[PDB]
Amino acid sequence: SGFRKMAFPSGKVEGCMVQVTCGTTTLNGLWLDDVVYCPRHVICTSEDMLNPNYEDLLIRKSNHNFLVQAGNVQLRVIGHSMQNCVLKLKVDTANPKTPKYKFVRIQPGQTFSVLACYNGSPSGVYQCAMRPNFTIKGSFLNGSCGSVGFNIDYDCVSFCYMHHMELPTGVHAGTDLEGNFYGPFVDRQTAQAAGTDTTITVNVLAWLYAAVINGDRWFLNRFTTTLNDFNLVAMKYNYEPLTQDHVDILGPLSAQTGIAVLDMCASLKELLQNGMNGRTILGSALLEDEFTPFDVVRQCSGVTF
Amino acid sequence: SGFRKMAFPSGKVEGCMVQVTCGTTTLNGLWLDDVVYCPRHVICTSEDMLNPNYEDLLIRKSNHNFLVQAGNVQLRVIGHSMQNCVLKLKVDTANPKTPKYKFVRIQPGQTFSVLACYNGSPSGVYQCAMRPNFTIKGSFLNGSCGSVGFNIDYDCVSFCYMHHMELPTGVHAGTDLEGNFYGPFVDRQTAQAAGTDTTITVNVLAWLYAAVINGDRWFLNRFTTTLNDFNLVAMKYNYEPLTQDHVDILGPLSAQTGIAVLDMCASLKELLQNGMNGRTILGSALLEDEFTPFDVVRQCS
Numbered sequence: 001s002g003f004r005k006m007a008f009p010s011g012k013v014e015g016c017m018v019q020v021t022c023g024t025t026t027l028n029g030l031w032l033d034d035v036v037y038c039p040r041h042v043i044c045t046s047e048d049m050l051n052p053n054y055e056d057l058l059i060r061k062s063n064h065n066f067l068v069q070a071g072n073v074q075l076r077v078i079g080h081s082m083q084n085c086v087l088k089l090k091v092d093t094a095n096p097k098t099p100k101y102k103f104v105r106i107q108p109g110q111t112f113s114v115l116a117c118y119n120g121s122p123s124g125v126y127q128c129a130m131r132p133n134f135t136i137k138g139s140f141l142n143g144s145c146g147s148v149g150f151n152i153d154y155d156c157v158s159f160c161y162m163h164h165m166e167l168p169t170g171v172h173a174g175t176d177l178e179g180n181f182y183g184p185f186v187d188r189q190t191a192q193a194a195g196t197d198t199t200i201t202v203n204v205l206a207w208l209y210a211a212v213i214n215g216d217r218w219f220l221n222r223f224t225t226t227l228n229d230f231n232l233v234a235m236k237y238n239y240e241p242l243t244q245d246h247v248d249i250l251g252p253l254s255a256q257t258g259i260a261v262l263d264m265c266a267s268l269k270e271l272l273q274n275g276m277n278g279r280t281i282l283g284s285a286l287l288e289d290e291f292t293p294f295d296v297v298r299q300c301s302g303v304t305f
Numbered sequence: 306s307g308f309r310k311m312a313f314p315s316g317k318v319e320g321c322m323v324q325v326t327c328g329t330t331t332l333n334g335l336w337l338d339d340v341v342y343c344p345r346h347v348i349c350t351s352e353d354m355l356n357p358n359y360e361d362l363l364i365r366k367s368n369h370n371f372l373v374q375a376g377n378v379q380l381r382v383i384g385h386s387m388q389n390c391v392l393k394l395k396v397d398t399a400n401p402k403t404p405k406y407k408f409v410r411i412q413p414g415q416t417f418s419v420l421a422c423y424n425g426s427p428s429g430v431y432q433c434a435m436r437p438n439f440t441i442k443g444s445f446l447n448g449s450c451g452s453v454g455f456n457i458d459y460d461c462v463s464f465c466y467m468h469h470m471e472l473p474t475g476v477h478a479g480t481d482l483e484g485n486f487y488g489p490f491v492d493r494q495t496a497q498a499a500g501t502d503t504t505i506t507v508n509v510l511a512w513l514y515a516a517v518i519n520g521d522r523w524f525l526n527r528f529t530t531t532l533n534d535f536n537l538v539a540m541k542y543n544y545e546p547l548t549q550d551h552v553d554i555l556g557p558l559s560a561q562t563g564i565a566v567l568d569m570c571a572s573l574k575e576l577l578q579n580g581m582n583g584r585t586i587l588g589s590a591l592l593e594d595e596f597t598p599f600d601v602v603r604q605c606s
């Protein structure tokens with residue numbers, strides 16, 4: 001029993017974290033094989049970030065301008081290239097701790113673990129979701145740029161995020177491992193604002209199933225709803241629309257608990273229009289939306305890595 | 306900016322997780338140097354669950370009764386001993402991935418990371434606090450026994466917990482790495498109940514300082530309180546009494562935010578009286594008590 005926000009074990013990723021320095025800027029890099037990936041803004045000064053021409057700044061750099069440190073060993077940069085908002089530093093040494101890995105771009109609503117790093121050293125691991133507005137509500141300080149988001153599929157690490165910046169509201173923006181930003185953000189010190197965030201509906205439903213598996217069943221009701229009536233209500237409360245794909249993905253949890261997806265949707269519809277009434281679900285007074293249906297199955301069934 | 310429940314990176318601990326089998330029972334073990342630590346209840350059959358005599362059961366076992374597996378390699382048990390509720394299996398191979406480590410016993414209110422494992426394989430990592438009733442509110446399934454609780458100080462893993470059992474309320478009980486249970490619990494199927502849980506007051510205060518550091522100020526007020534008046538109010542909401550030690554420990558956060566501890570204590574009194582009124586503090590509608598003052602300083606600085 002019990003339900004916790006749970007990150008993937010971070011060991012396979014910790015063995016890839018290195019420190020990358022360019023001039024006065026020091027951030028984190030991900031060392032996989034003989035390439036170190038890091039945000040391209042590591043080559044920027046204070047003036048540069050205001051309006052940077054990254055192609056021009058990178059051409060002016062040499063391999064000896066980049067200092068890469070893996071533990072107490074300095075790696076020598078033998079090449080440098082840029083792929084979108086990510087800098088790729090070719091090193092002379094393949095990372096002997098390179099796990100089986102893949103670069104994946106995630107969709108909003110999907111969850112992943114973040115290994116927050118400072119000076120190439122892992123300091124914490126937490127689980128978050130890519131918000132529907134493409135930001136992540138992370139916990140990052142100065143020096144955390146380059147920290148990565150990942151999932152673990154069997155024995156394969158799927159890198160899905162790299163940290164680039166903090167928006168004025170304290171939320172975070174970053175790219176996939178190919179340097180493509182999640183969301184309408186740019187890597188420049190300029191006024192940027194995330195769109196109004198919405199609740200990840202399929203994740204709330206999955207979390208309601210997790211509560212039922214754990215015996216917390218007060219919110220269950222006799223009612224069911226059509227997917228259209230549910231979406232009309234949910235949209236008014238800034239909840240993401242639930243698609244037939246989401247209903248299908250919630251199928252195994254529906255069969256395990258005996259509560260059809262549209263039956264749980266009528267529980268959610270009531271919770272939205274009326275609140276919790278002083279009650280809690282899994283010790284929470286708010287509906288939790290950072291557990292996907294897969295996360296709930298994995299945690300309530302004990303899948304290992 | 307931002308505030309998250311954050312676990313320590315689990316790599317140094319993952320390289321220590323092994324699978325321990327004794328008869329039909331399979332659980333996890335912690336492989337450090339040439340010793341594998343695991344719950345001694347791994348040696349129990351169905352008949353030895355209500356009233357096991359562990360000294361008698363262990364004497365009847367031989368090294369070949371224990372099967373230890375580290376990845377795909379079977380380790381050979383060359384010795385076995387018991388220290389309180391933990392079983393120590395001497396192996397003929399020192400763990401090459403043994404980190405710098407230490408065994409620490411923690412106090413209620415202290416936080417740590419749990420690396421939940423099944424069959425010697427790490428499946429997830431989460432953050433916990435030792436509850437004032439000495440239980441932990443973990444997330445564990447059958448087979449999680451031997452999963453460990455830890456903190457990391459620079460390059461050193463301080464092991465503070467080993468999972469042994471689930472109580473009838475779904476909360477968890479375990480021991481330090483010397484086999485001493487936290488709380489009045491025993492490794493027996495006999496009727497056991499945790500005492501009524503209470504809120505870790507010093508941790509709520511630390512979390513209110515974390516919110517202020519992150520720009521939340523709505524719960525602040527112009528009142529201050531005596532420590533005695535605060536404890537009289539807090540006790541009525543099942544909150545732990547705040548001692549002078551707790552006030553002193555909150556000193557650095559008090560100096561960083563410019564809000565004295567007893568000033569923050571009056572904010573906490575008001576939140577307990579009014580509730581949140583549809584507002585949240587750091588995205589939460591309830592007062593969070595699983596962040597110590599040390600955690601808040603670590604994460605914010």
Ligand SMILES: N#Cc1cccc(CC(=O)Nc2cncc3ccccc23)c1
Nearest residue numbers: 001346445446447469470471492493494
């Ligand atoms: N010392 C001890 C001890 C005494 C009685 C029984 C046990 C076994 C025990 O409590 N296992 C479990 C742990 N953690 C989670 C569990 C979820 C479901 C079912 C069992 C779970 C251990």
Ligand SMILES: [Cl-]
Nearest residue numbers: 249252294297
């Ligand atoms: Cl599924």
